[PDB]
Amino acid sequence: SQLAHNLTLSIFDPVANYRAARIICTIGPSTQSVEALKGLIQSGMSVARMNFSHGSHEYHQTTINNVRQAAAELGVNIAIALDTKGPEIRTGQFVGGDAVMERGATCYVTTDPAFADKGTKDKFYIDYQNLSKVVRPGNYIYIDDGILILQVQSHEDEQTLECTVTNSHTISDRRGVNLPGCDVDLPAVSAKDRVDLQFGVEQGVDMIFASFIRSAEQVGDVRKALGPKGRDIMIICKIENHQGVQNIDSIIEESDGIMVARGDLGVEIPAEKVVVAQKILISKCNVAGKPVICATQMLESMTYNPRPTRAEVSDVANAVFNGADCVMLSGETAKGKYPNEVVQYMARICLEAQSALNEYVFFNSIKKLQHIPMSADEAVCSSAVNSVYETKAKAMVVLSNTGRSARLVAKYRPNCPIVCVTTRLQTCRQLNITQGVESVFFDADKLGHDEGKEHRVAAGVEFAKSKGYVQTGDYCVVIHAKGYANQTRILLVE
Template sequence: MSEQLRRTRIIATLGPATDAPGMLKSIIAEGVDVVRLNFSHGDADDHRARAAAARVAAAELGREVAVLGDLQGPKIRVERFAEGAIHLEVGETFTLDCRADAPIGDSTRVGVGYLDLWRDVKPGDLLLLDDGLIAMEVVEVVTELVHCRVVVGGRLSDRKGINRQGGGLTVAALSDKDRHDIELAAELGVDFLAVSFVQTADDIEQARRLLREAGSDAAIVAKIERTEAVAALGEIIEASEVVMVARGDLGVEIGDAELPGLQKKIIRETLERSRVVITATQMMQSMVESPIPTRAEVLDVANAVIDGTDAVMLSEETAAGKHPDKAVAAMRRVCLGAERQFEPPADIGPGARVLDRTDQAIALATMFLAGRIGVRAIIALTESGATARWLSRHRSSVPIYALSRNGRARRRMLLYRDVHPIEFDPHEVGPAQAAREAIQHLFNLGHLAESDRVILTTGDHTGQLGGTNTLKVLRVGADGLAEGLGKL
């Protein structure tokens, strides 16, 4: 009962580093809640093997993990160089060749994957390559050729990305590869599907339609990484179940100076709209090589936690780093430390509005009471996990135990801050008996003790989707039996 429960969820990207024997079990044991399959790297067989291995490792540890598939999206990239890489000096001229039959790259030019790039840029535009490590100013645009002057030089290698500072590239959100990967995601039974380089809500709806046609009901994650997405932020949040602050390409497009404030804005607006939010990219980048994070990285993760993010994500740190398990352990420690030092204001949560669902109203009433009468825990008997999501939107230090027999719902709840999903099947008993069994189950697991006061939410009919319509204030009696309270 004394151990601090971590409230912020951790996502780890799988890759060659986590393929090492025993590493998957190690990172899950250290605290990974969701594993990410990055469809930008590896082939279908790699993703099949990693998804299966993650589920086996979690089961061996008596845990559940959710799986997030992340589409590559239409990231604009240079093609390949004859020598694999070149070095660009400041002031040199360099050409981006938009022809389908562009020759292999050399020190003066290289082909690009987006053949309409020359139509989207004009002289004076700044193009940022390899996440902004190299910068080129457009000098002249001739049919299918973009002639540039190097502003920031460096090493440029095969398949590095290209962004236009300020956005404005018209490439579609879903590529042909993404369409195939959506089918793969459905085959793998992913719990979440992330859509890259979203520009509008229509991009989300298109991905959802293709995913449903493939037979999957996975939740859609909108990655905010383009200037156009910032302009349409409200409609994109409304169209999605989850929003990701994808700080790599976003920072390149809008500029580093604007990124911190925008991160806070995205987190705040996502929570106000009762959606789930992930903060991602380079959170502990130094740990690709180092066994310990920098102080700046510690503060970065902690600030995201304090801002109210549901989850923080590791990318290259676990996929290709030297210390995947140490990176997860460090992130877990920082999350716990930030949560321990910072008590969320009671007012953090969805803005005041008319509630159109009974379970939303029950969640609001529950969190209002929890902050005023002093309870050990909130217990949600839920079929779909919807009640747990509404509860988690109102920030509180009180843990939420979400009991469900639905494995799909439990895995989706692994991304909700403050929520601890637990397998529980009331065996078709009535609500009163289900409540008693739920409290006794948590008592037996060591989550509750005698005399603890709890709030329990349930419905008139157990197992019914969206049926939560009741809250009860109860006290845990001897042997974990629930007792009603005559007075507070």
């Protein structure tokens, strides 16, 4: 058990010789240059996030080229992620750029576009045309990061709601609105999204962080928008509200992974429930064998302070203990004053937590949830991990061209590094969001097709050896493929 593992631990013992968790850094003006990106990579960045809420295609093109230049100069593979702006609900403009809302006061929110450019404290525009048919009397409208809270009293007409201002807040033009109780039916992907996504396809991005996913069918729209040429791009669904949490089973099934957006979830969901949601979503993904990212409000105070709060450190450690594959930095690296130091600290926290985490509890819990009879692929990968524990093997080598079996092996949480040997550089990059895995590129063009597998196996073994994971006389568990991996070897390291 984890409890039994805790008794045996000492904080003055040396830490693990590898970090399993993976760090996603969002790129901005602090970090867009190749020297800044090289600093990031060396600090621990595995994944570069592009926030398409800001900047233009040219700005992001520069991120892409610079990431690739930085990775090539350091001899590594860094994933590139496109985070979509997504559909939004915003207020319109206000007469005088401003509207002083006062507690107890009554106001009117309109679907009528005529008021888009002349709102006041008394009556203003909201750009979601289905607003009235989705909201009922009693429901709440949150405006400006949920700072202003309105309660709906009644429908004045088909397009207008009578609202009570429940607290004093002064709002400006084009502020973002949230609908806590309501099933927002905005399209999955907007127009900008659809052109961003084709840009991403054209620039060969590795994954999509798809904003505001509330439904399984919405995952299909991101898929269709990515088109036939985008079929190999991973779709990571951002879970940001109650709907997404409620439909999580069907969303996970359709997507390639999940981001837990704690800050966004917290706008309508009490903080203590988001903590629990994080547990649920992470575990569901762990059992599905799909990467899961813990995001927003991670080491936030370290954007301008050289040091985070203790509660922040603890937040990051427990993300790892929950079982997150990935931890993500936002403003801390995009606009922050200490981009290198925040990534380095995050690597240190993850590594410390990993040294305390009992991987076997994960292995055993997930193995118990398998129904007998298992299919071959599932039996092979769980057996391989089992053999790691039984022989105390010190590494795994998995031959996987698409990364699929590498993810299936990682799902079972061996207590040793996984080395994936693959013939696709895109697999190396995409595996950067799966914990416990390091990828080795084997160049089938430069080296042959290695149909017997021996060269790839030696490449993985050699990598493991050069990182000090295995030495002469150690065990290494090898798995390989015809479609999936059906073959296992327990190899004595020479």
